Amino acid sequence: EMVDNLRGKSGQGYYVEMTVGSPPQTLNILVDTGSSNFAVGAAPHPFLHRYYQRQLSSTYRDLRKGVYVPYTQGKWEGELGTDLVSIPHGPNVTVRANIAAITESDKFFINGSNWEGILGLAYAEIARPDDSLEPFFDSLVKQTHVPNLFSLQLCGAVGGSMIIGGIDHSLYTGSLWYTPIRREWYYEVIIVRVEINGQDLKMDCKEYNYDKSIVDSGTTNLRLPKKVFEAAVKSIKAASSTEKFPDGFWLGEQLVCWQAGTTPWNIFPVISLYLMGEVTNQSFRITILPQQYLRPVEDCYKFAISQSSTGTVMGAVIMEGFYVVFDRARKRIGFAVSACHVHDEFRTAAVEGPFVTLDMEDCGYNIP
Numbered sequence: 297e298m299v300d301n302l303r304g305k306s307g308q309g310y311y312v313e314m315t316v317g318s319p320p321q322t323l324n325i326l327v328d329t330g331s332s333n334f335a336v337g338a339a340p341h342p343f344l345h346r347y348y349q350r351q352l353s354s355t356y357r358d359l360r361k362g363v364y365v366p367y368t369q370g371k372w373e374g375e376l377g378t379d380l381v382s383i384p385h386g387p388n389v390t391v392r393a394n395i396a397a398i399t400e401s402d403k404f405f406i407n408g409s410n411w412e413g414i415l416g417l418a419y420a421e422i423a424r425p426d427d428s429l430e431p432f433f434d435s436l437v438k439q440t441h442v443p444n445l446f447s448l449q450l451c452g453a454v455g456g457s458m459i460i461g462g463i464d465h466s467l468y469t470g471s472l473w474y475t476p477i478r479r480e481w482y483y484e485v486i487i488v489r490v491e492i493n494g495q496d497l498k499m500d501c502k503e504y505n506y507d508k509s510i511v512d513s514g515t516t517n518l519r520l521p522k523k524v525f526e527a528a529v530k531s532i533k534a535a536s537s538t539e540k541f542p543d544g545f546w547l548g549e550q551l552v553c554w555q556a557g558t559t560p561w562n563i564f565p566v567i568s569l570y571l572m573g574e575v576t577n578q579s580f581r582i583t584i585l586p587q588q589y590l591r592p593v594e595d596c597y598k599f600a601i602s603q604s605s606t607g608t609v610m611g612a613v614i615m616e617g618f619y620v621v622f623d624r625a626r627k628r629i630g631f632a633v634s635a636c637h638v639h640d641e642f643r644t645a646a647v648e649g650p651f652v653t654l655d656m657e658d659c660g661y662n663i664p
């Protein structure tokens with residue numbers, strides 16, 4: 297009933313259908329594990345298919361508070377209020393949630409996209425304008441019997457599933473391996489080892505998490521810290537030396553093209569991230585393929601691994617390989633091989649363990 301409740305377009309994210317107010321107003325809302333506000337278009341911005349009309353809802357309540365949100369890539373400004381919210385292809389429930397009515401924005405909405413809002417699924421600490429503004433999932437858990445858990449199956453070329461309040465076993469193969477949530481703000485995790493085609497980058501594990509590592513469905517790329525990215529590109533270049541590519545390509549400043557149906561996947565290496573496990577000195581590894589990190593542009597592809605100054609971001613390139621369980625009740629994140637992941641006859645995405653790794657806690661970054 298919740299299976300295939302996500303739709304999308306390549307590089308434009310994944311959205312779920314939601315209803316807001318009384319009578320219900322249907323809206324397509326972007327699923328974002330890297331933010332914590334429920335913010336919807338509330339004015340006729342030309343890129344919008346539809347928007348939330350507060351004057352048409354008898355259950356709308358004004359909080360009489362503004363919210364101004366600049367961010368690296370843009371800005372949004374809204375008016376805070378509460379209303380009745382439901383997910384038609386989710387649990388049979390209605391909650392009173394905080395809604396930020398977007399009244400002004402810049403580089404927020406996408407020209408040609410089918411979503412009109414963002415559902416922030418992370419914790420209160422990162423909510424705007426402060427942690428006193430209760431996020432949607434927290435409201436859903438407080439007002440209903442829905443278990444404090446959700447899982448995501450993002451399927452690359454788009455569709456997928458958001459299982460609210462549970463795990464659907466048919467969406468994954470093999471076993472789920474759990475990594476602890478380091479702190480409840482973003483979905484912060486610890487990377488203890490990085491391998492390119494089984495070859496360790498041999499870096500101080502603190503570099504992998506400088507200044508944080510997060511699981512973010514609202515990001516397309518696998519974002520790596522500058523020093524880690526340099527070492528990863530150097531190794532990927534070496535493993536794929538059988539072909540040449542301008543530098544701009546590895547920088548995402550230009551595209552690479554092959555004649556159709558002939559892309560040389562085997563020349564490209566596998567990428568492995570070892571994550572902190574449940575028990576002391578134990579890790580597991582997640583492995584992704586060039587099918588995840590080479591993103592088709594509509595056979596032309598973009599290198600979807602990029603430099604970052606905000607730490608590791610496990611975006612859509614990571615998540616598309618895997619069934620991801622956001623186990624909020626147990627403060628952990630589960631990973632299992634996705635039954636919908638894109639692969640070939642030679643290599644498959646993998647979740648393997650246990651491994652023995654020492655000093656895993658030394659890998660977290662802490663402000664001096």
Ligand SMILES: CO[C@H]1CC[C@]2(CC1)Cc1ccc(-c3cncc(C)c3)cc1[C@@]21COC(N)=N1
Nearest residue numbers: 307308309330331333365367404424514515516
């Ligand atoms: C509280 O205000 C926050 C500020 C930051 C944004 C969310 C709301 C704003 C925003 C707008 C669009 C997209 C997006 C565009 N295209 C494709 C994808 C997949 C997503 C992502 C985001 C952000 C920025 O990063 C994350 N994770 N969400």
